[PDB]
Amino acid sequence: QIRIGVMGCADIARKVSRAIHLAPNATISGVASRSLEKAKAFATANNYPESTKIHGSYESLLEDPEIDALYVPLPTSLHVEWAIKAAEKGKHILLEKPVAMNVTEFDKIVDACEANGVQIMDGTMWVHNPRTALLKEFLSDSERFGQLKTVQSCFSFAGDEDFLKNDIRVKPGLDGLGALGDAGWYAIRATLLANNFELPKTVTAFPGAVLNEAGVILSCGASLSWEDGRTATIYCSFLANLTMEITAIGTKGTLRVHDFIIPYKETEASFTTSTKAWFNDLVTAWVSPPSEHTVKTELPQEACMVREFAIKNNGAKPDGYWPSISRKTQLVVDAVKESVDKNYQQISLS
Amino acid sequence: QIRIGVMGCADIARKVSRAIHLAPNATISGVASRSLEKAKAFATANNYPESTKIHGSYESLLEDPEIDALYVPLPTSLHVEWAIKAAEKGKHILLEKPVAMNVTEFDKIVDACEANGVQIMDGTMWVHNPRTALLKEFLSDSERFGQLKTVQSCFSFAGDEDFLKNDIRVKPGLDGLGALGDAGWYAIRATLLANNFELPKTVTAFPGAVLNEAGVILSCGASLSWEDGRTATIYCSFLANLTMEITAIGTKGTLRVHDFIIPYKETEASFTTSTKAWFNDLVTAWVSPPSEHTVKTELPQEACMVREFARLVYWPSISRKTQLVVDAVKESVDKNYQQISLS
Numbered sequence: 001q002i003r004i005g006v007m008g009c010a011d012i013a014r015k016v017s018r019a020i021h022l023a024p025n026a027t028i029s030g031v032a033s034r035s036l037e038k039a040k041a042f043a044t045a046n047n048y049p050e051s052t053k054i055h056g057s058y059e060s061l062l063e064d065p066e067i068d069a070l071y072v073p074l075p076t077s078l079h080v081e082w083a084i085k086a087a088e089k090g091k092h093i094l095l096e097k098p099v100a101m102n103v104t105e106f107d108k109i110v111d112a113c114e115a116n117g118v119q120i121m122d123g124t125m126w127v128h129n130p131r132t133a134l135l136k137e138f139l140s141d142s143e144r145f146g147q148l149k150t151v152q153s154c155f156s157f158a159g160d161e162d163f164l165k166n167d168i169r170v171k172p173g174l175d176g177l178g179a180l181g182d183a184g185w186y187a188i189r190a191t192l193l194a195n196n197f198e199l200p201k202t203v204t205a206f207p208g209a210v211l212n213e214a215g216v217i218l219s220c221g222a223s224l225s226w227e228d229g230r231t232a233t234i235y236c237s238f239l240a241n242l243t244m245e246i247t248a249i250g251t252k253g254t255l256r257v258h259d260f261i262i263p264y265k266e267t268e269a270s271f272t273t274s275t276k277a278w279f280n281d282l283v284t285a286w287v288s289p290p291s292e293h294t295v296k297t298e299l300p301q302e303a304c305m306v307r308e309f310a311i312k313n314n315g316a317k318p319d320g321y322w323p324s325i326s327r328k329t330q331l332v333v334d335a336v337k338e339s340v341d342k343n344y345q346q347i348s349l350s
Numbered sequence: 351q352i353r354i355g356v357m358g359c360a361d362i363a364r365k366v367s368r369a370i371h372l373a374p375n376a377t378i379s380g381v382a383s384r385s386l387e388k389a390k391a392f393a394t395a396n397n398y399p400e401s402t403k404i405h406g407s408y409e410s411l412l413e414d415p416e417i418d419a420l421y422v423p424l425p426t427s428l429h430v431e432w433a434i435k436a437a438e439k440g441k442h443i444l445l446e447k448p449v450a451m452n453v454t455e456f457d458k459i460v461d462a463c464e465a466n467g468v469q470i471m472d473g474t475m476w477v478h479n480p481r482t483a484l485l486k487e488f489l490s491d492s493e494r495f496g497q498l499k500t501v502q503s504c505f506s507f508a509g510d511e512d513f514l515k516n517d518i519r520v521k522p523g524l525d526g527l528g529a530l531g532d533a534g535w536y537a538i539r540a541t542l543l544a545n546n547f548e549l550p551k552t553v554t555a556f557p558g559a560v561l562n563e564a565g566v567i568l569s570c571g572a573s574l575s576w577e578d579g580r581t582a583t584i585y586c587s588f589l590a591n592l593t594m595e596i597t598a599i600g601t602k603g604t605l606r607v608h609d610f611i612i613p614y615k616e617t618e619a620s621f622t623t624s625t626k627a628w629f630n631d632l633v634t635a636w637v638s639p640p641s642e643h644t645v646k647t648e649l650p651q652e653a654c655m656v657r658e659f660a661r662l663v664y665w666p667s668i669s670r671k672t673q674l675v676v677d678a679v680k681e682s683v684d685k686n687y688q689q690i691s692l693s
Contacts (some may be wrong), residue, residue, distance in 0.1 A: 015632050079394040149590035150570070152502065152583075156599055158626075170641040199645070207552060207689060208575035219499070221573065221581065223556035229569060231558045233502075233583055240499040242636075243625050249506055258606075262629060263640045274507075277592040282365050284616045284650065286592070286609070301632070344689075346557060 001308040003031030006092075007041040007065040007082065008074045010095065012123075016071055016300060017046045022303035026310035028052055029068075032061035058082060062089045065154060067231035068312065076181060081103040083120075087112035091309060094309050096123040098333060099326050106330050110323045121309045121317040122326045124189060126261050128308060129301035132193075133268030134293070138255055139194055139248065144275045146252030151186035151194040154235035155244045155261055156219070164238065170216055178217035178270055179240035180336055183236035186261050188332045190246045191232040192325070199328055200224035200232070203335035204346040210239065210249075222336045234336070252276055258289070263301070270294035352660040353418050355411050356402075357382035357432065359392040360423035361444070361648070366473070368397050369652035372458070376660040379403060382411035406431060412439045419444065419659070421473070423523040426531060427451055433459040433470075442469040444659050445669075448531035453673045460666045471658075471665040474539060476611050479651040479659055481556055481619035482543075484643075488605055489598060494625045496601030499542040504585035505535035505611060506569070507592045519588070520566050530679055533586035536611045536674045540596045541574065541582045542668065546559040549671055550582065553678035554689045555599030560589065572679045584679075602626055604640070616650040 004020055006013055009031065020028050028048050033039035036056030043054055055061040061070070062085055069092035075081055077336045083093055093113065100106040113120045126132060138145050146288050156179075159167065168174040169182050192199075202225050209220035219237030244262070248255045253275040263269050274290035299307070311318065335347040351356075354370055354377065357361050363381075370378045378398060383389035384408030405411040411420070412435060419442035424432055429450045436443050443463070449472050449486055450456040459682045463470045476482065489495055509517065518524040519532050542548070552575050557568035569587035596607040603625035624640035649657075678690045 005666070015634065018632070018634075076529070102379070104621060120664045149506070149587060150571075150585060152504075152585070154597075155504070156499070157603060202557060204557060204687075206573040206575070206581055207554060208573075208579065208581045210579045219579065221500075221583070223558075223571065223573075224407065225558040226554070229558055229560040229589070231556055231571065232681070233556070233585070235500065235502070237499060237599075239601070239623065241496075241602060241604045243599055243604045243624075245597065247593070247595065249587075249593050251508060252591060253590070254591045256608075258640070262633060262634045262636065266634055273633075274591065274593075281610065282368070283612060286612070286614050289614045290608070295400060298555065310540070344554075346687075 003029035003066065003080065003266060004067045005032060005061050005064065005070050007032050007061055007072045007086070009038050009069045010073040013042070014046055014074045016073070017048070017308070019306050020071070021300035022300060023306070029066065030055060030061055030064055032058055034058070043139060062086050068092060069094065070277070072133045075168050077101055077174050077176055080108060082342055083109045084112045087116045090116055090118060090120040094118045094306065095124065098177055098185050099288070099330050101176060102334050103327060103330050106327060110327065113318070113323065116221050117318065119311065121310070121322040125302045125305050126186070126320060127189065128304035129263070129269055131295055132296060135219045135257070135271060136193065136254065137274055138253070143274070145255065146250040146254050148194060148230050148248065148250050151191045151232045151246070151248040153190040153232070153246050155183040156184050156235070156237035156240040157183070157242045159238045159242060168212070169238070170212055170217050170279035171340065172214050176216060177333065178236045178297050179219050180217045180333055184220070184234055184333065184336060185329060187234035187236055187255040189329050191234060192332070194248045195226070195230065197328065198226065199331065199349055201227045201350070202272055202346050202348050203332060203339055205336050205344050209342050210284065211338045217337070220336065220340060220341065224332065254290070264302040267297060268294055269297055276324055298340070352376040352415060352662065353419040355382070355420045357408055357411055357415065357420045357422050357436070358424045359388050360381040360459060363392070363421065364396055365652060366421055366423070369516070369650070369656045372442050372481070372649065372653040373656035373660060374570055376656050380405060380411050380417045382406070382408055382586045384464065385615055398628060401649070407411040412436060412441070413613050416624045418442060419448045422446060425518050426527060427524055430455045430459060434462045437462045437466045438589055439466050440466050440468060444471055444473055445607070446473045447535050448527050448676060449669050449673050451526060452677050453670060456670055456673050460670065463666070469659070469661055472669045473655070473663065474536070475655050476536070476654045477539065477543065478655040479613070479619055480647050480654070481621065481645050485605065485643065486543070488623060489600070491603070493602065494550065495603035498545060498580055499599050499601065500580065501541050501582045503540045503582070503596050505533040505536050505594050506585070506587035506590040508590060509588045514588070518682035520562055520568070520684070522563070522564045526566055527676060527680070529569055529586045529588045530567045534584060534676060535672060537584035537586055540610070540669050541584055543559065544581070544596070544598050545576070545580065547668060548576070549674065551577050551693050553675060553682055554681035554692055555667045555679055555687045557687050570683060572682065574675070606640070617647060618644055619647055
């Protein structure tokens, strides 16, 4: 029933197109490019239904009164103008990660959204995966996991030379946050989720961040601190074999997932779990190796995403949880970027 | 065949006596304690053979001349004394990790081993696991794994109440490097190992280290920078559930170890591997997920350690690198998480 337009014919749109009408309370009703040509091409390539209204401009798609909500895979640096213009037409927004170039810009967006009573949500797929509920459940269990001590997350991939010269992620004027915004993002969200959405008190990047000639981050890392003795580390890179880890350790347990951003298969999600582990009397064996658990997921996680995204009929307020999680993730992103610019200085989040 | 003396009746000597036992080119010959009281009970308790020279001092055992080498499981802070003193009696030392309370001290022990022409080697067991070769080998494959970018390592376990009150690992005067010396050591070692034995250039501790009231580290972490885009992180704790990971990320592959200090079973060791990968076209799945390799270890790693030590007539070098990294880390915490240059 909920009608979605696609603002921008980027590559990530194909996967989300499929999510939109694996639906099943949401549907593709419009697509827009800067070029009618390309929007035309995109719609047929991706088998969009005949009734899909096909726009040759962003402005034009915003203006179409038979679209409830937009999906916006636009470069990061377009978000502040175009998410705002869209809020302003009563479009609800599914905004791609990272949400903006900084938290000031993202506060504008959210304001516009509140102002118009629309829902905003960000592109983060993995948090809607049923596994994620199981992850949060384990981390909340005071006997299987206990009190949290550390969480370590990372995501890296090896961009080919074409990617390193050409992709929007290496360009300061589009996706200008680089590996931090594109991959660090996810490592930050996992550490925030593990920590019951509590912000850290301080952030400090690791020496040795790689920038490209244009000053844009190819790889970097950080520790976060809650001054509790809970801490976390993030790591991300454009220059190293695909790897995507969560490792989280508490007083009574340990949690591992190795495919946390994109599962191995869409059909399943597995995570590994270990509680009060130890050695036999002689330390020649562990008494019990970690347990592996796997969950059937009939509906892919991105489909769960639009699903939950898809008030207009019952008159509720928007759910502030989403923009709120998004602001927190973007704040850590800026602390990290600002610790590097300031030469690896400890950044207070007060 | 090689005649070994246990200087000190440590609970860890119980698994090393078995190491020695099973090591075919070595034999358990002497064992001292500070009281021949417990020396006799340790020897009985641990099924010692008849001919085992039971001594009631460290000195008693340093003069026995039918002993070529000593395993030394003494608290960290006794190393500097008893290790200079075993070498002047011209005995070869299997020294327990951490090697000493700082690198100054360990250089003093190494000198005295050279001066007297003897072999020193710390008791890091795991680097003698057979797994550890095909793995140095997997990380040397500039095609299956490529150029190294980062390596993450940690070790944590959960001290109960007694441990945190009574263990020698929380006493400043005893094993006073705490978690860094007892657990960080292993992570640091994996980090040097993976990087082909090269000191990083700087070391910086993560804010939020936990110290006890005596000022002993119960948890802490750090990053190491080699300044060419290679970095590493290490983490260790006495306050969190058992966890032992190595993760190394190269240009073309990734290696993962989840046991590593102490495998799950002594009779085998596993690790996970992945090279190029990759999603399908719709990023809807992984094109080849990582894969599991197991290796049969007919002989446990502590036993392979003793065998190797039983060399007769590098290790001090690697010991020093890791001790050095330990002190860098510690100096960083004490100087408020400042970066610390390793010359």
